[PDB]
Each structure stands twice: as C-alpha cells, then as structure tokens.
C-alpha cells in the first residue's frame, strides 16, 4: 500500500507524519508547486502545533529522505502531469483544496494513480466515506475518486451515529467552535475570492461566524439523518483543536449518563480508534495530537430534559483528520487497487 | 442621582466610564482596598480594550478629580465601614464579585447607601432586573438590594423575550462563546477556590468549557420561560465581546426573516437602546464599546426547519453590561431613593 | 490638495481614515483590483484594531460616498491604466507593496498623477523623506516619485536625530518588537516568494525573528549616521503597535534623564506632532491610534553607564505611519504640484 | 539522590516531569497548600504547553502514584512544618516564589532537608549557581541554601561565558523577549503587590516592558562581567519560549561566523547539554520542550562591525530551566548531602 500526496499543506504534511508512524502504508511521492524540496523539508521538520518531526528529514536532491526512505518530490500545477505511476503511488491524497471535483481530481488517474482520496467535502457528488460510519459501503468497482469529508464531519458523524442508533435523532443543530485555518488572515484584508468577507478579518483577535456544510454532510454519510441536521461554525483564535456542540431532540428519553454509556460502549467496541470519551476537566490543548475523530466530553454536556440535549465532542481538526485519511487509504488499498 | 462603586475592576471602572458619558448620574465615591488612589487613576486612564479614558484623571489627594469633579476614594475591606452617606452616594454599584448575597450586600446600607445593585447573578434570592425585560417589576418598597444579572442574561433575555412573545419558546439551549475574564489565568495553575479546574488552564491558547447559570436566570427574569432554557459557556482567548448562540424549538413557525423583523420591530420601539440588529458581515471586534445588550446577527443564524432555529446575538460583555447597570441605577433612582 | 490611493490595504485604508480627519487634503480616488466597491466599503467601515469608521460609508455605484463626498473607485492591475488625472488626484499614495521602484511607481504619472509617495522603503534609490527629520530636503524639481520610508524608520529616525544632534551616536543597534502584518500567516505554510521562510510560520503563537532594513534606512534619511546603525526585528502575535529598542554608544555622556529632556524639548518644539514622550507605565495597547511617529518611554529605558544606553520608543505601525504619509502628501502639495 | 518539591507550579511540575525522564534523581514528596492531591494529579497529567504527562498519575490517598512510585503529598503553608526527612527528601526544590531568602528557605532544613535549591534569583546574597558556568564553585561545607538563578540568567550566562572567554565583553545590554508567566493577568487589573503596574495589564494583547535583574545576575555568576551587563525584558503574549538578545561591544574583533564557531565548539565540548546552536529558520515554538539552557541562532544575529554585535539565543523558560534545576540537584547530591 503506497501513497502520493498532492498539496503539502497542513493536511498533506500531517498525512505524511501519520504514515511515518504507520507500518502498512508508505508515502512515496509528494507534489507541491509553491515549495521546492528544501522548503518542503523545513515545513516537514518544524511545526508550530505538532512539534519537531519525530525522525529524520534530509534533501537527497529533488527528493526527500525521510527516516532513510526515498520520497520523490514534484512541482506540477497540473495533476495530469505528476508521474504517480512512475513513482509507484497507488492512492493519491488530494490535499490542495483546489481539486475537489471528480472532473479535476480524476486527472490524477492519467498520472497512473489507481485511487484518489479528496481531503475535503466535494463541490460535486463524489461519495464521502467516514471511517467507522459508512466506509464499508465503499465499492471499488464503482468509484476511483472518493472524499474523506471534513474534520468536522469526521467528529460529528461517529457521535451522531451512536446517538441515532441507540436513541434516534429527531432534529439537531450543530455549532463547531473551530480553531483557525489557512483560509484566515493575520490582519483585516480581502478574502481570497471575496466570498467569506468575515473570514478575511484579523484571525487572532476575533470570534468569526462561518458557514459549514459539515452537518448536512452527515446526511450523506448517514442517510437516516438526511435533512435532520444543519449547523454553523465559529472560528476562534486558538491554533488547533476544535469542538462540536450538537443540540438534538431525541426520539427516546436519554440522560447524559445513558448517552455517555452508549458512547463508551461504541468507543470500546465497533468504533475503537475513531470515537473516544473523557470525564476529565479537559480543555482544547489536551487533544493536540489526538488520533481520535471525536472525543465525547461527559462533564461539558447539558440536558434541558430527558429528550433535548447538548453534547460536546472535541476533535483535533489537523491530527485526527489526517489519521482518518491514512485509515481510509489503508482501507481502500485492502479492497483492491 | 448619585452612584458609589464598590470594587474598581473591569465592571466598576467601565461603570465609571459610562457615567462620565451620562448627564443624569454621577459617580461620587469609589472603594477598592487592592489599589491606592494613584493606581486607581492609572487603571482608569488606560484600558487594553476600551482605549484611553475620554477625559481627565488626576489625583487630588486620596481623591480623584475626573473631568474636574471630585470622586472620594476609600480602601475598606468591610462594606459596613465605607462612608457612602457622608460621600453623598445614594446607589452602590457592588462590583467586587464577593458580596453577591443580600446578607453581605445589605451591609452597604449601614454606610448610608439607600440602594445596592449587585453587578452579578446572586448566590441567594436577591431579585434580578434586566433593563427592557422586567425592570418595571421593581418595587422600591420591597427591595433595597437588587441584581443586574450577568452580561449573558442581559444578552439572552431581551432576545428570548422578543422570540417568546411573538412565536413562543417550547425548549431552548444556549451556548455562549465568551471572551476571557479576570477569573481565568495566563498559565495553567490552581483556580482560586479549586472549583472550576478548567478555568485555571492557560487562557490564551485554550477553548475552555464553562458552566453558566445565565440561561436558568432568564427563567427568573421571564417566569414564562422557567425550566425552558439551560445553557453552557465556552471561554475563548479573545479579550472582549461574546456571542450567545440560542437554539430553540418554537411553538409557532418562524423563518429567520420573520424573527429578524420581530427583532427589528422591538429594537426600533420598546427595546430601543437595549436590543440591536445587524445584517453586516460582522465579527466580535466590531462590537467593542457597543452599548447595546444584545445585537442580533441575521446572517449568522440558521434554521433547520420553520420550527427549530439557532439564533446568534453578540454582546460586549464589559461595555454593554456596564451601560445597563448605569441604566438600572438611573431607573432605580427615578422610582424613589 | 487631492490624494489618490493605490492599494486599499491596511495603510491605504488608514491613509483614507487619516485624511477624513484632515481639512487640507481629500481622497478623491481609490484603486484596488482585489476588492469591488461594496467590499471596499466593508473593509473601510469595520476595522479589527481601529474600530468602526468615524463617519458614513455608502456605495453610490462603482463609487464610494464617504462623509457625503464622492470617491471614485477603480479595479486596475496596471498603474498606467488608472485615470488619476480624470479623477482630479494630484498625489498618489502607492500602498500596494508591489510598485516600490521608480520604474514601476512612475507609471502612475501616465495616469496624470503629478507626484507619487511610495508607502514602503524602495527597492531602488527613490529618495526617502521622514517628516520632521529630512522632509525639507525634498526638491520638487528633482523628484516626482518619493518614499515615506517604513513605520520603523519613522519611529527610529526622529529619536536618532534628537540623540545624535545633542549627544552624538558612535554606534547603534536596533531591535524592533513588531506587531504582526499581512505578510504573516495564521498557520505554518509556504511564504509568498519562499523568501522569509520564518515569516510563513503560524503568526499567533510564535516569536519570529525578521530582517529589517529600517536602521540602515536611517543612514539615508540622516547621512551623519550612514554605517552607524543596523538592526533586526522580532515579529510577535499582537495585532498592532510596535516598539523600537535602540542600543547606542554615545559620543558625549548622557543620563536617561538628560536624554528624556532632549526628547521633551524636541517634542514640544521642532518635532511637535512627530516625536512624543511618556513617563507612564504604558503598554502597547495604550498607543492604538496614536498619531505620533515615536513615543519615548522614559521608564522602560536603561543605561549601562553614562555612555552606553538602551532607549525604548513605541509606535503605532499602522496609524502613526498613515498620518505621516498624509503629512508628507500635504507637505509635497505645498512645495508645488 | 532524592528530591522534594515545595510549590507545585509551572517550575515545580516541570521539575517533576524532568525527574521522571531521569534515572539518577527521584521526586519523593511535594508540598502545595493551594491544591489537594486530586488537583495536583490533574495539573500534572495535563499541560497546555508541554502536553499530556508521559506516564501514569493516580491518587493513592493523600499521595500520588507516578509511574508506579509513591510520592508523598503535603499541604503546609509553613516550610518548618513539611516533614521532608520523614519522606526521605534530601534536596528541596523551593519553587513557590515566596521563600527566596536564606532566612525563609533555611526553614526547610528544620523539616530534615539537607540542601535547598531556590528556583528563583534570591532577594538576599544566597549564592547562585548556573550549570556549565560556575556550578563547580559550589562548596557543600559553606552553603546549604543555593539558587539556580532565573531562566534568563541560565540562557545569557553560558552565551556570555563563551563570548567573554574567547573575545572579551567590554560592555553589553540584554533585551529578553519573554513569554507570559503566572505573574501576569488575563485582563487589566491590580498587580499582586501594586509593584509592576504594567505586569497587571491584559497579557494576551499587549507588549509589556519589564525590569529584569537577569543581566546583573550574570555579574555574580561570572565575576569578570560584574558591572558590564544590564538588561530589560519585554513580555509578549506567547505561552512559552523566550529569546535573549545580547548587544555587546567586544574587546577583540569577531565575525558572527567566528562567534558561531566558538559557540559550536563549547556546545560540542564543555557545555554539552547546556549550550546549543542552530542555523535553521527557527521560531519560538520550535524549542517547546528543549532541554538546552540557551540555543544560539546564527541567522538571527547581526553585527554592526567586527566589534559591536547583537546575538540572539532562544530558551525554553519553563522546560530548559527545570532541567537545569534537576541537573544542579543531581550535581549537589554528588558533592555530599
Ligand atoms: N486544516 C484543517 O483543519 C483541515 C481539516 C480537514 C480538511 N481540511 C481541508 O484540506 C484541504 C487542505 O487544507 P490545509 O489546511 O492543509 O490547507 P493549506 O493551505 O495548509 O494547504 C494547501 C496546500 O496545497 C498547495 N497547493 C495549492 N495549489 C496546488 C496545486 N495546484 N498543486 C499542488 N499543491 C497545490 C499549497 O501550496 C499548500 O501547501 C482543504 O480542502 C481543507 O478544507 C483542512
Ligand atoms: N467582565 C465581565 O465580562 C463581567 C460582565 C458582567 C458581570 N461581571 C461580574 O462583575 C463582578 C466583577 O467582575 P470584573 O470582571 O470587574 O472582575 P475584576 O476582578 O476585574 O474586578 C473585581 C474588583 O473588586 C475588587 N475587590 C475585591 N475584594 C474587594 C473588597 N472586599 N472590597 C472592595 N473591592 C474589592 C478587586 O480588587 C477588583 O478590582 C463579578 O461578579 C463578575 O461575575 C463581569
Ligand atoms: N501595516 C504596517 O504596519 C505597515 C507600516 C508601514 C508601511 N507598510 C508598507 O505598506 C505597504 C502595504 O502594507 P499593508 O500592511 O497595507 O499591506 P496589505 O496587504 O494590507 O495591503 C496591500 C493592498 O494592495 C492591494 N494590491 C495588490 N496588488 C495591487 C495592484 N496591482 N494594484 C492595486 N492594489 C493592489 C491588495 O489587494 C491589498 O489590499 C507595504 O509596502 C508595507 O511594507 C506597512
Ligand atoms: N515559569 C517561568 O518561566 C520561570 C522560569 C524560571 C524561574 N521561575 C521562578 O520560579 C518560581 C515559581 O514560578 P512558576 O512560574 O512556577 O509560578 P507559579 O505561580 O506557576 O507557581 C508557584 C506555586 O507555588 C505555590 N505556593 C504558593 N505559596 C506556597 C506556599 N507557602 N507553600 C507551598 N507552595 C506555595 C502556588 O500554589 C503555585 O502552585 C518563581 O520564583 C519564578 O520567578 C519561573
């Protein structure tokens, strides 16, 4: 099982770091036109959130040598031009943020990639898989280009699945309090695209409302919840770790204690490694580098009555997501190509 | 109408700044044992959020001279010892955070104060008034010690009143994304009281869940909503301005447009000066120094269906609250003593 | 005296805000291709540091109406294409950051501008004027394109002039602790140009060393100090206000008290409005919106001996600079064209 | 070699974490009256800078069990009352910040401690040792109570020793750009002691000048430099890692390259483990958890001429200092008692 990364950004670099921990997938090629091999080596070795790379990075010459293993480096604007097949890359992690359609992401298959995982929710009807929710619905004969959804969908959908299966979600509304991202700016200025005028405001001293499609995305991943969730985000100045705040009306009565046991039962059985739980007095920094998709915080939750609850789940939007994308690439490899 | 301030902290100092804008109430005495007159002058003249004091501050000698008017200064630990009557202070703004019972705050009446406004939700059954919600229920013959509730209750209760009167709230759950406060710490350490273990975590790099009684407080201020709201807070690193995120099931169908008109109608009529609205792409810094209790953000709100909505309202937790406390002191003066 | 702004960024917008306070210069046209008239109106009305615009902004139709006065708006990538003469703009404030040569900035004169002020230190030998230092050396018959230097050069050169004239600078080394800027990124990523690899690291949680040419620039503005100063910057997460820390060996003995009087004498005479001083326990937020170039902080300075001193001067890098650029445009207008 | 910790704050807790990495010293007792055993366990297991404790923490019952080893816990205000001898603690790390005299810190010897290390510069003439500078001057027959100096003195004195021995320091002035500390406040308020009025200003949005005695302290640790250094600090909002900026006139000519080799030679020989160096484009976050006292940043330094240089050295003020205090406790144990 071999992996190519297009776009060596926050997700592309932490996907690389996650594979270097992992014995059943290897990164064999990277493409990023806005950094040479030496700048790629620097942004890999040093991270302002995730700390110094655990291992060795050197430049061998238009290639990286990461823990002693050769990683071919490319600088191609066009996906059709990256020689993925020559490099021996079977799956491409597409993490540029700018090839989020089947039309655009399928051009990677001309380079000789077998499968493409988009690291984003798609602009079209590319199927989204979330690990431990609907990843086993994946059909290798039907799709070559798939999406791993967003950080937030990977947080919310495991929690929503547990809740819906055990109690039933009638109606739900999510807020995500979300750490800041590359789309935001250090000082007030024109947003790229003049599209989210608010995203362009000084990131470090503002609470910034954002639209997110994450909650409607849970309706694709869990069709039972189609039209039962919507949601909004609030961007805050912290550098990493985000929190989903899911308000739902339940079809059956459930105490927070009953919900906590339902979560604990799934975390210790079918969603081992994806869903986690805590009863500790935790704060966002406590999950930097957490590999779980979703950590249910028992003591932060509040119920109005047995039927109407607000549930709090943490997620490392950088590190948790990247582990899931590597999980899905391992899973997709096991199903053939 | 004359005002004494006990506790020259964030609320005590901005109450002073609000009165200096105001022609129908004057601050005549301050008490704070943890700052001398010269340090009081400094913390008044300079503010990291609210900017340089608009006017003159000098030390005349154990007294302040603020815009040319003498303000007597005291350094008394015990409220029974502050000579409020001698200084000519009729109302005491009690903003220490440590005399939030009738038992403790009534000791100010021994000093010759006529009325006490607690600048906090009380630990006992002191009545809470919120301006433009239930302030006209105040009976001067029945209470000498009253509370102005919290910043958050002053944000949520005007919005909840508008919504409940027009559509009816069945059930509601609030999240407040709240700017950081004096209870928090710059670095991880023992909380004062070892009570909110999470509040003691490094304030500047963490998202910190908090308990808040603000939403249950709306059930005292609006008895129709007793038991219909609860709520939680999330402390974030921004220095000022907070946002209430009210998820409610409504008894009547309402679009966000219908809710926006209901808010606009109340902001331009009975809640002039308390409730505001915006359709601009606003972010938290845009309300620093806003005197409104609550600014409804039309474009941040989201409805799941005609009956289940999430509403977003901003509030300057420092400046908006302080104006309301000065409003209530003016109102309480007009009712006698 | 009329002013056109090319580049409606942090400096372009605060130059506009400074002129709206000012009765002897008017902004008559703006050019920015990366924002339409409606987005320009938004970024003008709302500021995360400088607060809500003091006055009215509306869109009249591909034009702004700012405090009731028409400001023509353009969206041209090429300076040769902006019709400055048609709009009646005599001086162009060139604040894009990308036309910092005479070759590139002189193309504005094809549009019918008479004079160009670059809002940056130049990449070539365009002359730099600093107000109250060497602005009277300006020869209108010799130069049409001039530079206003940097924020830091405007802080350091008034202080260096006072010190050098009174005591004599033998050798000096500057550090500027500098608030974050549009060149920085919210999260770790490729710098624009792959040039300052460090500038591309997460701005909000890092102390970031930077190169600055500000101190060598003081050697152009004050030729007596050519080769006597160099300097470096440290970027820190605060949103605005910077501090120059000038370590100098002096040719004559001077106590900090003697230096404080020298500064006070110049602030109250020849550098009225440019150089300021404080003996208060000030912190960076206390100078947000300060119009001075340089505020000498007496109590932060330290001398090793009568000859070797470290001097601390604050500056609002956004607001102070923008006032100086408007000052220089008023001055340049008074000298002819 | 056994260690007791008085004061389980940032330094007390990271001293514990450093010993748990270390095979030649064991923490056997902790005293902190402002946290019970359960709150001590929480503040040990979770850290907003240093991440989750690497190992196990449980409460056995008024005792901790840390990686399976019993650590006795006390809650005594008075040092004379802590039974250090009963617990088997030979050295006491005194890290409260409030027993920084021989008079006060010697009361720990009544509890049956043999030696006391103050984790601070002393208010009196307690001797200061810095590891790899003057620690071998320590005489166990002459002193039972010693100081490990400050974080900054441990950064500056190794660098100053290398520079002075090789080139000679004529005169030097230090600035430290310093991460925020427990003395600072989240919002503007009275400083504890009304002493550093500036330290009491909102920590997260301000650049705050501070006095530091660190540079004069280098004159005790290196008597050759008595009266040759002074220095000041600037507190900035970052949560950890600080940078010393040493401007010195040298007695011999030295290029930054010659200084870099002098540092490299000492880092790889006599100051192995204390002094480090980097030529990478590093930023403060890159040294979180660095165990070095001082990391010389070649590419951030600047020389005016061969004789007058500004040198930049990083230090983790929390983690680097704590390792040095554990180093000194190991060293002091090896010399007898
Ligand atoms: N960071 C998060 O919290 C997060 C979490 C989940 C998903 N995502 C998604 O992942 C994607 C990337 O996010 P990010 O945070 O890493 O952003 P980023 O800006 O840090 O990374 C994008 C990278 O792609 C590169 N790139 C741009 N155009 C390219 C091209 N034509 N070919 C190759 N490389 C190109 C850029 O140079 C950059 O390094 C987005 O779709 C985003 O929505 C981000
Ligand atoms: N800041 C906010 O956002 C906010 C908003 C609404 C209400 N409040 C409430 O207002 C109160 C004060 O809040 P704050 O933010 O100003 O806190 P703060 O810590 O800034 O102010 C409290 C002040 O009281 C002084 N004080 C303490 N003990 C005293 C005594 N015995 N006598 C006199 N003065 C004494 C302290 O020195 C300090 O200056 C609290 O009850 C708080 O919950 C705060
Ligand atoms: N902010 C500071 O502290 C500061 C202080 C002094 C000087 N400066 C200098 O001023 C300049 C601008 O700085 P800033 O902080 O405002 O940056 P900014 O990024 O906020 O502003 C630059 C603006 O120019 C626009 N622009 C880009 N290309 C253009 C083009 N071809 N035509 C017209 N407009 C174009 C951009 O859209 C943007 O709005 C730089 O040279 C900078 O070094 C900045
Ligand atoms: N954090 C740094 O960067 C740094 C670096 C080097 C040295 N220091 C020094 O170390 C000392 C502690 O610093 P810190 O940052 O850990 O501060 P801190 O406030 O985090 O820790 C002090 C601890 O001492 C406890 N304490 C107070 N009174 C006590 C008493 N009578 N008995 C026992 N415990 C008591 C407090 O509860 C607290 O947990 C200070 O002298 C400081 O100057 C700090």
How many CB atoms neighbour CB A54 within 10 A? 10
- Listing DSSP states for C255-283 in one string gives -HHHHHHHHHHHHTTTTTTTEEEE-S---
Based on C-alpha coordinates, what's the Rg of chain D? 20
Going by alpha carbons, the residue nearest to atom 1 of ligand 4 is D318
Secondary structure in 3-state letters for chain A: CEEEEECCCHHHHHHHHHHHCCCCCEEEEEECCCCCHHHHHHHHHCCCCCCCCCCCEEECCCEEEECCEEEEEECCCCHHHCCHHHHCCCEEEECCCCCCCHHHHHHHHCCCCCEEEECCCCCCCCCECCCCCCHHHCCCCCCCEEECCCHHHHHHHHHHHHHHHHCCEEEEEEEEEECCCCCCECCCCCCCCCCCCCCCCEHHHCCEEEECCHHHHHHHHCHHHCCCEEEEEEECCCCCCEEEEEEEEECCCCCHHHHHHHHHHHHCCCCCCCEEEECCCCCHHHHCCCCCCEEEEHHHCEEEECCEEEEEEEECCCHHHHHHHHHHHHHHHHCCC
Nearest CA among C328, C187, C311 for reference residue C255? C311
Going by C-beta distance under 8 Å and a sequence separation of 6 or more, which residues neighbour residue C14?
Answer: C50, C318, C319, C322
Spatial contact of B273 and B194, defined as CB atoms under 8 Å apart: no
Going by alpha carbons, the residue nearest to atom 27 of ligand 1 is A96
Q: What are phi and psi of D128, to 5 degrees?
A: -105, 130
The span from the CA of A60 to the CA of A38, in Å, is: 10
Tell whether ligand 1 has an atom less than 6 A from the beta carbon of residue A153: no
Q: Are strands D275-278 and D294-297 parallel, antiparallel or unpaired?
A: parallel
The span from the CA of B320 to the CA of B287, in Å, is: 9
Q: Are strands B115-118 and D115-118 parallel, antiparallel or unpaired?
A: unpaired
Spatial contact of A115 and A106, defined as CB atoms under 8 Å apart: no
Decide: helix, strand or coil at residue D317: coil
Spatial contact of C205 and D204, defined as CB atoms under 8 Å apart: no
Buried b (16+ CB within 10 A) or exposed e, C59-91: beeeebebeeeebbbbbeeebeebbbeebebbb
The span from the CA of C188 to the CA of C203, in Å, is: 8
Give, in order, the Cα–Cα distances in Å from A159 to each of A168, A245, A303, D301: 12, 11, 16, 51
The span from the CA of D208 to the CA of D198, in Å, is: 7
The span from the CA of B149 to the CA of B153, in Å, is: 6
User: Given its phi and psi angles, is residue D7 left (phi above 0), alpha (psi -120 to 50 degrees) or beta?
Assistant: left
Q: Which helix (H) or strand (E) element contains residue C157? A: helix C151-166
Residues in B closer than 8 angstroms to A302, CB to CB, are 173, 230-232
Beta bridge partners of C295: C276, C314
Residue C244 burial by Cβ neighbours in a 10 Å radius (0-12, 13-18, 19+): buried
Spatial contact of A187 and C239, defined as CB atoms under 8 Å apart: yes
Give, in order, the Cα–Cα distances in Å from C80 to each of C30, C103, C296: 14, 12, 42
Beta bridge partners of B26: B2
The span from the CA of C166 to the CA of C147, in Å, is: 27
Q: Are strands A2-6 and A26-31 parallel, antiparallel or unpaired?
A: parallel
The span from the CA of D100 to the CA of D184, in Å, is: 19
Q: Are strands A91-94 and A115-118 parallel, antiparallel or unpaired?
A: parallel
Helix axis angle for D151-166 and D256-267, nearest 10°, is 110
Decide: helix, strand or coil at residue C309: strand
How many CB atoms neighbour CB D258 within 10 A? 15
The verdict on whether residue C301 carries a ligand-binding annotation is: no
Cβ distance of B280 and C42 shorter than 8 Å: yes
Helix axis angle for D10-20 and D319-334, nearest 10°, is 60
Spatial contact of C295 and C319, defined as CB atoms under 8 Å apart: no
Nearest CA among C132, B230, D260, C76 for reference residue A302? B230
Ordered by where they begin, the domains of chain A are 1-148+318-337 (3.40.50.720), 149-317 (3.30.360.10)
Going by C-beta distance under 8 Å and a sequence separation of 6 or more, which residues neighbour residue A265?
Answer: none
Q: Enter the tokens of residue C238.
A: 């605060």
The span from the CA of D321 to the CA of D9, in Å, is: 13
Beta bridge partners of B313: B244, B296
The span from the CA of A333 to the CA of A114, in Å, is: 10
Tell whether ligand 1 has an atom less than 6 A from the beta carbon of residue A119: yes
Helix axis angle for D151-166 and D319-334, nearest 10°, is 70
What determination technique applies here? cryo-EM
Beta bridge partners of D294: D275
Spatial contact of A241 and A317, defined as CB atoms under 8 Å apart: yes
The span from the CA of B12 to the CA of B283, in Å, is: 26
Q: Enter the tokens of residue D194.
A: 């009304």
Cβ distance of B201 and D48 shorter than 8 Å: yes
Q: Which helix (H) or strand (E) element contains residue C165? A: helix C151-166
Secondary structure in 3-state letters for C76-124: CCCHHHCCHHHHCCCEEEECCCCCCCHHHHHHHHCCCCCEEEECCCCCC
Spatial contact of D43 and D59, defined as CB atoms under 8 Å apart: no
Q: What is the DSSP letter of D284?
A: G
Helix axis angle for B214-221 and B151-166, nearest 10°, is 50
Spatial contact of D20 and D54, defined as CB atoms under 8 Å apart: yes
Nearest CA among D289, D287, D291, D290 for reference residue D300? D287
Starting at the earlier edge strand, list the strands of the sheet with B69-74: B57-59, B63-66, B69-74, B26-31, B2-6, B91-94, B115-118, B145-147
**Terminal CA-CA length for chain B:** 9
- Listing DSSP states for C14-76 in one string gives HHHHHHHT-SS-EEEEEE-TTS-HHHHHHHHH--TTT-S-SS-EEE-SSEEEETTEEEEEE--
Decide: helix, strand or coil at residue D155: helix
Distance in Å, alpha carbon of A61 to nearest chain B alpha carbon: 39
How many CB atoms neighbour CB C143 within 10 A? 16
Longest dimension (CA), chain B: 63
Starting at the earlier edge strand, list the strands of the sheet with C145-147: C57-59, C63-66, C69-74, C26-31, C2-6, C91-94, C115-118, C145-147
* Closest ligand by atom to D185 CA: 2
**Terminal CA-CA length for chain C:** 9
- Cα–ligand 1 centroid distance for A319 (angstroms): 14
Q: What are phi and psi of A183, to 5 degrees?
A: -70, -20
Sign of dihedral through CA atoms D123, D127, D131, D133?
Answer: positive
Q: What is the DSSP letter of D185?
A: B
Going by C-beta distance under 8 Å and a sequence separation of 6 or more, which residues neighbour residue A290?
Answer: A241, A276, A314, A315, A316, A319, A320
Nearest CA among D80, D97, D84 for reference residue D7? D97
Distance in Å, alpha carbon of C104 to nearest chain B alpha carbon: 35
Beta bridge partners of D295: D276, D314
Residues in C closer than 8 angstroms to A32, CB to CB, are 190
Going by C-beta distance under 8 Å and a sequence separation of 6 or more, which residues neighbour residue C107?
Answer: C78, C79, C80, C99
Secondary structure in 3-state letters for chain B: CEEEEECCCHHHHHHHHHHHCCCCCEEEEEECCCCCHHHHHHHHHCCCCCCCCCCCEEECCCEEEECCEEEEEECCCCHHHCCHHHHCCCEEEECCCCCCCHHHHHHHHCCCCCEEEECCCCCCCCCECCCCCCHHHCCCCCCCEEECCCHHHHHHHHHHHHHHHHCCEEEEEEEEEECCCCCCECCCCCCCCCCCCCCCCEHHHCCEEEECCHHHHHHHHCHHHCCCEEEEEEECCCCCCEEEEEEEEECCCCCHHHHHHHHHHHHCCCCCCCEEEECCCCCHHHHCCCCCCEEEEHHHCEEEECCEEEEEEEECCCHHHHHHHHHHHHHHHHCCC
Helices (H), C172-292: 214-221, 256-267
The span from the CA of A70 to the CA of B45, in Å, is: 62
Question: Taking the CA of residue D94 as centre, how many other CA atoms within 13 Å lie in the half-sphere pointing to its CB?
Answer: 32
Give, in order, the Cα–Cα distances in Å from C218 to each of A127, C101, C161, C294, C319: 60, 19, 9, 14, 20
Residues in C closer than 8 angstroms to A205, CB to CB, are 48-49, 239
Cβ distance of D281 and C197 shorter than 8 Å: yes
Decide: helix, strand or coil at residue C216: helix
Contacting chains of A (3 CB pairs or more, <8 Å) are: B, C, D
Helices (H), chain D: 10-20, 37-45, 84-87, 102-105, 151-166, 214-221, 256-267, 319-334
Going by C-beta distance under 8 Å and a sequence separation of 6 or more, which residues neighbour residue D141?
Answer: none
Contacting chains of D (3 CB pairs or more, <8 Å) are: A, B, C
Longest dimension (CA), chain D: 63
Residues in C closer than 8 angstroms to D250, CB to CB, are none
The span from the CA of D203 to the CA of D188, in Å, is: 8
Cβ distance of C209 and D249 shorter than 8 Å: no
Cβ distance of B48 and C285 shorter than 8 Å: yes
Going by C-beta distance under 8 Å and a sequence separation of 6 or more, which residues neighbour residue B239?
Answer: A205, B48, B49, B179, B180, D187, D202, D204, D205
Spatial contact of A66 and A56, defined as CB atoms under 8 Å apart: yes
Nearest CA among A335, A315, A326 for reference residue A19? A326
Beta bridge partners of B309: B248, B303
* Closest ligand by atom to C32 CA: 3
The span from the CA of A178 to the CA of A313, in Å, is: 12
Between CA B45 and CA B50, with CA B49 as vertex, the angle to 5 degrees is 50
Q: Enter the tokens of residue B36.
A: 């001398």
Nearest CA among C244, C254, C252, C279 for reference residue C157? C244
Going by C-beta distance under 8 Å and a sequence separation of 6 or more, which residues neighbour residue D213?
Answer: D121, D150
Residue matched to tokens 């019970």:
D36
**Counting one residue from C and one from D, how many pairs have CB atoms under 8 Å apart?**
130
The span from the CA of A58 to the CA of A66, in Å, is: 7
Helix axis angle for A319-334 and A151-166, nearest 10°, is 70
Distance in Å, alpha carbon of C38 to nearest chain A alpha carbon: 10
Spatial contact of B313 and B282, defined as CB atoms under 8 Å apart: no
Based on C-alpha coordinates, what's the Rg of chain C? 20
Q: Which helix (H) or strand (E) element contains residue D244? A: strand D242-250
Nearest CA among C321, D181, D233, A116 for reference residue B189? D181
Q: Enter the tokens of residue B72.
A: 């007597």
Q: Enter the tokens of residue D222.
A: 């290196």
Residue matched to tokens 């102070």:
C320
- Listing DSSP states for D76-126 in one string gives -SSGGGS-HHHHT--EEEE-SSS--SHHHHGGGGTTT-SEEEESS--SS--
Decide: helix, strand or coil at residue D325: helix
Q: What are phi and psi of C187, to 5 degrees?
A: -140, 160
Q: What are phi and psi of C35, to 5 degrees?
A: -155, 135
Between CA B285 and CA B295, with CA B291 as vertex, the angle to 5 degrees is 65
Question: Taking the CA of residue A5 as centre, how many other CA atoms within 13 Å lie in the half-sphere pointing to its CB?
Answer: 27
How many helices (H) does chain C have, and how many strands (E)? 8, 16
Q: What are phi and psi of B155, to 5 degrees?
A: -75, -50
Decide: helix, strand or coil at residue D53: coil
How many CB atoms neighbour CB B139 within 10 A? 9
Nearest CA among C130, C177, C160 for reference residue C323? C130
Q: Are strands D294-297 and D308-315 parallel, antiparallel or unpaired?
A: antiparallel
Nearest CA among D53, D46, D54, D4 for reference residue D26? D4
Spatial contact of B103 and B110, defined as CB atoms under 8 Å apart: no
Spatial contact of D52 and D46, defined as CB atoms under 8 Å apart: yes
Q: Enter the tokens of residue C62.
A: 């591909």
Beta bridge partners of B3: B27, B91
Residue matched to tokens 């540092």:
D263
Decide: helix, strand or coil at residue D173: strand
């Amino acid at each position: 099982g071999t992996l190519g990364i297009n776009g060596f950004g926050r997700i592309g670099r932490l996907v690389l770091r996650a594979c270097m921990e992992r014995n059943d997938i290897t990164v064999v090629a990277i493409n990023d036109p806005f950094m040479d091999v030496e700048y790629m080596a620097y942004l890999l070795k040093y991270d302002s959130v995730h700390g110094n790379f655990n291992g060795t990075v050197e430049v061998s010459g238009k290639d990286l040598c990461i823990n002693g293993k050769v990683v071919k480096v490319f600088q191609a604007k066009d996906p059709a031009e990256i020689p993925w097949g020559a490099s021996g890359a079977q799956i491409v992690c597409e993490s540029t943020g700018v090839f989020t359609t089947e039309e655009k992401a399928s051009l990677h298959l001309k380079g000789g990639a077998k499968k493409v995982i988009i690291s984003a929710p798609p602009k079209d009807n590319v199927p989204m898989y979330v690990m431990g929710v609907n990843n086993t619905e994946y059909d290798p004969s039907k799709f070559n280009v798939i999406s791993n959804a967003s950080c937030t969908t990977n947080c919310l959908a495991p929690l929503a699945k547990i809740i819906n299966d055990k109690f039933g979600i009638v109606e739900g509304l999510m807020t995500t309090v979300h750490s800041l991202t590359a789309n935001q700016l250090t000082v007030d200025g024109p947003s790229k695209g003049g599209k989210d005028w608010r995203a362009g405001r000084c990131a470090g001293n503002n609470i910034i409302p954002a639209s997110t499609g994450a909650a409607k995305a849970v309706g694709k991943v869990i069709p039972a919840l189609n039209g039962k969730l919507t949601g909004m985000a609030i961007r805050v100045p912290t550098p990493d770790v985000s929190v989903v705040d899911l308000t739902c009306k339940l079809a059956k009565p459930a105490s927070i204690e009953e919900i906590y046991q339902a979560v604990k039962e799934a975390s210790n059985g079918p969603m081992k490694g994806i869903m986690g739980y805590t009863s500790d007095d935790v704060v966002s920094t406590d999950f930097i580098g957490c590999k779980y998709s979703s950590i249910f915080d028992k003591n932060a939750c509040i119920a109005l009555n047995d039927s109407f609850v607000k549930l709090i789940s943490w997620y490392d939007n950088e590190s948790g997501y990247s582990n899931r994308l590597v999980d899905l690439a391992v899973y997709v490899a096991s199903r053939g190509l």
